[PDB]
């Protein structure tokens, strides 16, 4: 048994309960209680491992069998700042708090749906409805940070950065954002929490940024927000903002509805899945006009009329328009819906294909009548579909492919190099050997 740095070996010569019969058949060995002094365990995240191995070998040195295992020992932690609790604001929003982080629990869309439901349902399924604001999550404020583009001289090699908060709840630091530096400015909007009675009178909260060249904290090296008697969070003047490009505070900003929150499933069902299902059912029964009306709540190439003018957006579904991802493990099982949820562009393509199917079905139905007017109508439908699709492309890489040997194509080195490059691209961004030298 291995416990941290201590290793204890118990042999059957002295810790055996009863030596079994000496025979070629099954021989069961049982042991008296074993004592382990596990006073040297390294507890990370309030959990430490403990290793147990059963070993048995004959006089010849042959291993009759080896069994390995790891035991988990958990440390009980009932500290007040590590116990998540639920609170409800005066606006009716419920949030669950753990340490410094807060999570919205309920939703308030049902109360506001009545105004849209009083008129026709066309008022319910609009981008304006989906852009409704939400009450703030407890006590706090909003902030906007501008991260400068990556430069080797000041940032240093790897393009990764993190934003930490400090002096809230406790006096330690917790990571509130992580990301990759790029070649352009980055705009980040965040919700900074604030407790009722601040710990440090001078600065109510502190936010700082870390990268490779400066992986530390420093003194006064970041925005120090202080709240007056009546709102109005201000930045302490004696705060160095060299790392940031610009840090601003938004004193009344209310974030719109979130399509990645706890109630994301219901929002997606109400706004995307339901009209699509209704359109599919109507199309299956050859009710084309109603099907078009129902699918127009999601996509319409002619635009959408709002207040008497064409709306600037293209897709009426806000999560589709903004490409909001609400799934982190899409490949845990064979599920096309999960993959589409991870990257909602596939939903755009699916809607487009459904529209094209409806148009082609209309054209075929008109064609099957043989009347001259029916023929003209079918021609119009086909021309419209062709114009929507565009012009089809041709093969490009077929003639650029050098036929490899079967052993070469299955070589482990090639796959390892490709996977290493993909991992470096996704997680880092270092561009060593910029040209890939396509001969390899």
């Amino acid at each position: 048994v291995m416990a941290g740095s201590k290793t204890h070996t118990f042999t059957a010569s002295d810790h055996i309960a009863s030596l079994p019969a000496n025979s070629f058949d099954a021989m069961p060995y049982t042991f008296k209680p074993l004592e382990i002094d596990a006073s040297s365990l390294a507890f990370t995240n309030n959990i430490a491992p403990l290793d147990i191995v059963f070993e048995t070998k004959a006089k010849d040195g042959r291993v009759l069998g080896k069994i390995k295992q790891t035991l988990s020992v958990k440390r009980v932690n009932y500290n007040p700042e590590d116990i998540l609790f639920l609170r409800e604001t005066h606006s009716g929003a419920q949030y669950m708090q753990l340490g410094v982080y807060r999570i919205r629990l309920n939703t308030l869309l049902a109360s506001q749906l009545v105004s849209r439901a009083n008129t026709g349902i066309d008022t319910i399924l609009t981008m304006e409805t989906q852009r409704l604001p939400e009450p703030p999550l407890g006590e706090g404020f909003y902030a906007t940070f501008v991260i400068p583009p990556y430069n080797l001289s000041t940032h240093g090699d790897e393009r990764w950065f993190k934003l930490y908060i400090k002096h809230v709840v406790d006096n330690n630091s917790h990571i509130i954002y992580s990301g990759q530096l790029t070649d352009t400015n980055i705009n980040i909007t965040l919700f900074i929490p604030l407790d009722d009675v601040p710990l440090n009178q001078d600065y109510h909260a502190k936010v700082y940024m870390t990268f490779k060249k400066s992986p530390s904290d420093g003194t006064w090296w970041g925005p120090h927000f202080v709240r007056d008697d009546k709102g109005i969070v201000t930045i302490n003047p004696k705060s160095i903002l060299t790392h940031f490009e610009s840090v601003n505070v938004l004193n009344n900003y209310s974030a719109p509805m979130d399509f990645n929150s706890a109630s994301a499933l219901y929002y997606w069902e109400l706004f995307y899945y339901t009209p699509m299902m209704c359109f599919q059912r109507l199309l299956q029964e050859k009710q084309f006009d109603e099907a078009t009306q129902w699918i127009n709540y999601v996509y319409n190439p002619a635009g959408y009329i709002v207040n008497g003018e064409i709306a600037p957006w293209i897709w009426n579904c806000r999560p589709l328009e903004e490409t909001t991802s609400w799934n982190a493990n899409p490949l845990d099982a064979i599920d096309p819906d999960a993959v589409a949820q991870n990257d909602p562009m596939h939903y755009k393509i699916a809607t487009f294909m459904r529209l094209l199917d409806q148009l082609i079905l209309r054209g075929d139905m008109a064609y099957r009548e043989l009347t001259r007017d029916a023929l003209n109508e079918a021609k119009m439908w086909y021309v419209r579909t062709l114009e929507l699709l565009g012009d089809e492309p041709e093969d490009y890489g077929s003639q650029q492919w050098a036929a490899p040997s079967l052993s070469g194509a299955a070589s482990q080195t090639v796959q390892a190099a490709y996977q290493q490059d993909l991992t470096m691209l996704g997680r880092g961004g270092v561009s060593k050997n910029l040209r890939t030298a396509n001969s390899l």
Binding site: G65, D82, L84, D196
Partner: protein, 343 residues
């Protein structure tokens, strides 16, 4: 063909997206689906079906979380279970769970949550003293109920309130079993000083896995709590075993669980705002699994094999600053046998 289809699924999922069916479809969506399943359809019919769906959505989305329970000894891992109550004036309740371990850098992926599921077992809790728990490693609902009863054989007929603790568990197929019932009137009257209307009675439940039991505490909501037992008259205890039998806890046993007071509901000092804290699984100082199944292994040259390796009992003792672990009946069998060959 099958390999091609499976591989293509990732790159081109739109070829397999069916609008009428999807893994994880909510019940109300299905109800709408059969509402529009006839052969011929009109605009009014579809609008009426959508209105019914809107009614269901309004009912579901108005839920407010009333109780929570975390199935671990610390907040780093485990699953959190929530029970919530509707807005209407009906005793309708729902439950769900989330995986808090998926948190990274503050925000949680939307797939870590679970859809609300209804409870249909005729619950009539008193105010908001209803909460979930996980004892015997399956979900349980525990609540209290109040009735008005008069003592028999008294010339001036006087009435009083009888409080009954009810516990039920969720079966395999999603149904709920009949609930066990206990009488806790004396404990409530003791901890509330016979003023249940002015004081907010509160209930907490935890699952002691080490001894395979369920601990129940009834207390009066306050700003802070002292150590249990002894002179502290504000907390009463109860212990429930596997078979359903109970046992009222005494002072010596009550003082053992004084560390659980940090998971009680309190009144916020800055502003009289009620805050609810999710209960936690109890342990003394450290949690270790009660048993460990070694498994089996194959020896060299496929000649021998070890089987039935098992440690059925593992205990821990934290004395002063030293933690000691005791393993009981560590056993395994060795047998000469090959796992399939001429040998």
């Amino acid at each position: 063909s099958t390999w091609g289809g499976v591989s293509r699924l990732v790159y081109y999922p739109e070829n397999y997206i069916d609008p009428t069916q999807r893994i994880g479809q909510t019940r109300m969506m299905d109800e709408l689906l059969e509402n529009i399943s006839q052969s011929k359809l009109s605009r009014d019919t579809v609008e009426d079906a959508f209105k019914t769906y809107l009614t269901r959505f309004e009912t579901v989305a108005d839920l407010k979380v009333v109780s929570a329970y975390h199935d671990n000894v610390n907040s780093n891992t485990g699953l959190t279970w929530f029970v919530g109550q509707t807005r209407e004036n009906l005793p309708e309740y729902y439950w769900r769970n989330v995986d808090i371990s998926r948190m990274q850098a503050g925000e949680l992926a939307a797939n870590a949550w679970k859809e609300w599921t209804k409870i249909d077992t005729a619950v009539n809790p008193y105010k908001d003293a209803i909460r979930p728990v996980i004892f015997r490693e399956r979900l349980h609902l525990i609540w209290v109920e109040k009735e008005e009863v008069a003592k028999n054989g008294t010339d001036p007929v006087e009435t009083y309130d009888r409080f009954t603790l009810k516990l039920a568990f969720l079966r395999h197929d999603g149904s709920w079993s009949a609930p066990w019932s206990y009488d806790i009137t004396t404990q409530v009257e003791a901890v509330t000083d016979k003023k249940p209307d002015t004081e907010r009675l509160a209930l907490a439940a935890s699952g002691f896995q080490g001894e395979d039991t369920l601990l129940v505490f009834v207390y009066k909501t306050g700003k802070s709590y002292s150590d249990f037992g002894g002179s502290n008259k504000n907390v009463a205890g109860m212990t429930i075993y596997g078979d359903g039998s109970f046992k009222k806890m005494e002072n010596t046993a009550l003082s053992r669980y004084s560390q659980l007071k940090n998971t009680f509901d309190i009144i916020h000092t800055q502003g009289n705002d009620l805050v609810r804290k999710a209960s936690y699984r109890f342990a003394q100082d450290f949690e270790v699994p009660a048993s460990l199944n070694m498994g089996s292994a194959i020896g060299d040259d496929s000649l021998t094999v070890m089987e039935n390796g098992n440690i059925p009992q593992i205990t821990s003792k934290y004395s002063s600053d030293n933690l000691a672990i005791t393993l009981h009946n560590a056993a395994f069998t060795v047998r000469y046998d090959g796992s399939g060959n001429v040998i």
